[PDB]
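Lecture 7, part B: from sequences to assemblies.

Below are the input chains for today's worked example.
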Amino acid sequence: NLYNILKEVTENAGYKDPDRFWTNPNSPEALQAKAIREQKE
Amino acid sequence: PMDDEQVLRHLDQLVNDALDFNSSELSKQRSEALKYYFGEPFGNERPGKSGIVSRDVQETVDWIMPSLMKVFTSGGQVVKYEPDTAEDVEQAEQETEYVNYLFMRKNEGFKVMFDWFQDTLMMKTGVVKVYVEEVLKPTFIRKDKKKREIKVLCVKPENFLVDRLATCIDDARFLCHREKYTVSDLRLLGVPEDVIEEANREVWASECYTLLDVDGDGISELRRILYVGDYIISNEPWDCRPFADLNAYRIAHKFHGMSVYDKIRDIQEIRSVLMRNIMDNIYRTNQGRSVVLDNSITPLETPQLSGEVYGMLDRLEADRGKRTGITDRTRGAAMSVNQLMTAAEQQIDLIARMFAETGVKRLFQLLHDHAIKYQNQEEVFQLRGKWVAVNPANWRERSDLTVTVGIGNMNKDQQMLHLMRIWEMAQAVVGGGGLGVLVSEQNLYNILKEVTENAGYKDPDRFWTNPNSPEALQAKAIREQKE
Amino acid sequence: PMDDEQVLRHLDQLVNDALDFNSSELSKQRSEALKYYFGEPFGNERPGKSGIVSRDVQETVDWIMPSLMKVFTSGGQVVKYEPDTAEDVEQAEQETEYVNYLFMRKNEGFKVMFDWFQDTLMMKTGVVKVYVEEVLKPTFIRKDKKKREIKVLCVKPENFLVDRLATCIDDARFLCHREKYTVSDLRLLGVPEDVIEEANREVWASECYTLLDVDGDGISELRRILYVGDYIISNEPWDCRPFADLNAYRIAHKFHGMSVYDKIRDIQEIRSVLMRNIMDNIYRTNQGRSVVLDGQVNLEDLLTNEAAGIVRVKSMNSITPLETPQLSGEVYGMLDRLEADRGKRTGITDRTRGAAMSVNQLMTAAEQQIDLIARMFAETGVKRLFQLLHDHAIKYQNQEEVFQLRGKWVAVNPANWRERSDLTVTVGIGNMNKDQQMLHLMRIWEMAQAVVGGGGLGVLVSEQNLYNILKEVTENAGYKDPDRFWTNPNSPEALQAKAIREQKE
Amino acid sequence: QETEYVNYLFMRKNEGFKVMFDWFQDTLMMKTGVVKVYVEEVLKPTF
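Predicted structure of the full complex, as structure tokens:
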């Protein structure tokens, strides 16, 4: 939801979906962008 | 049905009607516009007294045109095609650069659009003609054979007689365009004779776009008729009319457009008359009104004019602002965001939105003219390589919303807000999350990109792509995870 | 068809028409322009009173010119060719340097360009002539023979007779340019005789560019005719007309363009008339308006100006001295209003230059229209650049370039690319050096610190491209290639600087 | 999804905006802003 929090800014900046995709919900990125990267370091 | 000569006389009659009506009304209107702009005496200036005419609309044009050229003449990013998602890089931006790189740096740059603005604002209507020609000098290595070109020119809409019953570009049932096409063109066509009207025969020509029923059938196409002087014509099943017929204010349902002259003429008249009257009264006070006989003497004193009278001159200037360029001044925490909202929501940018929409039609016209057949030439579109654009997909839609008072975040504010917000946000990301964990170096590429393009260099100067490649294999794989 | 003499009379008739029309109209326009500019009295100034003309357009021209010299007299980056991508370093910038290094530092400098600017703004039509000559002084080592040159001169468009029905450079069917070409040139050509018009025969000459049919064929090319005095002419098939016909404002569909004079003449008139009226009224108040009669004050009070101060009526001092009305100082504020209008008309900065440092030098001194005029001037000069590029790509010489390095082949076989790009020169993308460089500097430095922190040194933009990154700074500092070489691309300096000096240590 | 469908068919596929501009005009000087919605078809198949 920091995703969505920065999103409201991004949409307010005129670019909603693609420019700051940022999604990282639960995905090949999120497995290494929310668990592998942080909990292993 | 089966009309080959009654079409000629019908076109002649329609030419006569367009002549009478368009000529009288619009010529008188645009002539009044020209007289007011050029600042000549209006005719009420009696001899022996100052014919002071203060040009007031000229500085207004000087005000509006530069903003117009920033918004238009700024890169080649005004009009995208907005296709479906997949087939954008294929042709949307590709054919976009094709048409614009043929439109900038290959079609006169902006000068014709400049005169188009002027024609809609002074001459009351901005309209141009798009047509084609050829290229020459082959190998006689240098194989320049049958190369086709498509190009546009101002028509001097006084040479664009048309029925008033259109109100839109795709509504003129009778498009009449006037030209000279003198003896050289006559010989090139092959006409052996002439008309009543020496290579300087100053002959005149007319082109007609009109749809009829000349085949004993249903609704036939438009027809292009080279009715010159009731002589050898060049008729053709005609598909697209290459014109744009601006109006300069996007006025209500009428074809010819109310000119910026039409609404600043009163202001100009008031200004010139007031200053002339005040200086005339100053002259009257200076010369003296003394009763002479044919020495009692009854010298009356001419009433002097208080100094407040010129405050309404400043008021008139503020109105001339607040009429259209509502910032009376040059530009009427938070740094006055977006340059004080693009200089206080300027109506000029609204007329710019309308103009961009008008030029959307022109872009589709040219995209047709080249997607039928133009040439096989590539693009210097940030890189080498482009196939023949005689078989693109027109997409039937041209997107130019990012140009005007709408979302339209302008570069000197778009880029500054972008850089500030993205930099603070991304540095917090690096501190808290990291680089590639959140929006990655591959999209930090695009993140820096927006700045790069806003700085004027789009693709090559800051390549930064590093997507998945020899630069990426050592730049996103081994440089960081093996160190 | 087979016209070798009727061409002469047709050209003479066109000369006469150009004379009458162009001379009358445009000469009167430029003459009134000069009368206003030089600040001499307009002719309405009666004797016995000050014909003071407050010069207003002169300082205006002084205002407009210097920016034009900044934008013009700035490096060799004014016009690029923009060819297909690969063939840029081959000829594009190479031939650009050739033509400009000949254009600048080898073609008179910009005094011709300055006078072009004046001619379009002051003499109302900026146009010049480009032609060729030869070189001399051989070994008589020193082999200097038959070298061909191309050079430009002001035409003094009073000596550039042309029909008004052109409105464009490639539309004049009759280009008549006037010169003197005195007895020396007559001898050099070889004409044995003279005309009506002692080596001071002050003979006058004319050159015509015009196309017709003289062969009984299709539309023939242009022809260059040395119609001098109905004497030996030098006719030739003609391909290029070397002129530019500026108009100072890119005016609408008319050839001769309205001048800066044509729009500041009113400002100057109003200013001078009002100030002269004010000072005349001040003089009237100072001298005093006292009604004198006949019989008494036979000496007319010595015009109320001598060093006596005695009325000396005779017997009566009734006297009706009316007080001359005073002029309030609020009119002086209208002088400031006039100055602001004179600015806001073209040089819309009322002052010398009317957090984020007022980005781009306050948007280039508040979106100055003078840069607009610069853009359309530069577009006009593109045509001149292509003309000279022709003149040298046909045949100029085999000489090299001093282009930041040694080496350049013969520029008599370039590819003209048919296009000259000068977009970055004006109000457009046009990121100007004193702002382009600074924004580039700040953005690169912040980008680079972030990249070093997160990405690294060569992982992102690398020392070869960080080299070009440093370059933009270098070129913006005025020294482009040689001062900061830094290239280090793949080379002996790259072998010990980008190959072995980091991974092995 | 349908919101984007209708708006994208409405902006950039129904002429963009201009109409409601006229709408405003139609109710500011023309005193009554009103427009008509109808249907048509498309042609040029594989031939």
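Note for the exam: Chains C and A do not touch (no CB pair under 8 Å). Keep this in mind when comparing with the next example.
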